[PDB]
């Protein structure tokens, strides 16, 4: 993937959107 991610996966790495925190994307 060449970005959305980078920020994203962070974001998943992280617990998902279920954190205090949207999507990347």
Partial sequence: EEEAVR???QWLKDGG???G???PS
């Fill in 7 to 9: 920020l994203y996966i």
């Fill in 17 to 19: 959107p279920s954190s």
């Fill in 21 to 23: 925190r949207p999507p």
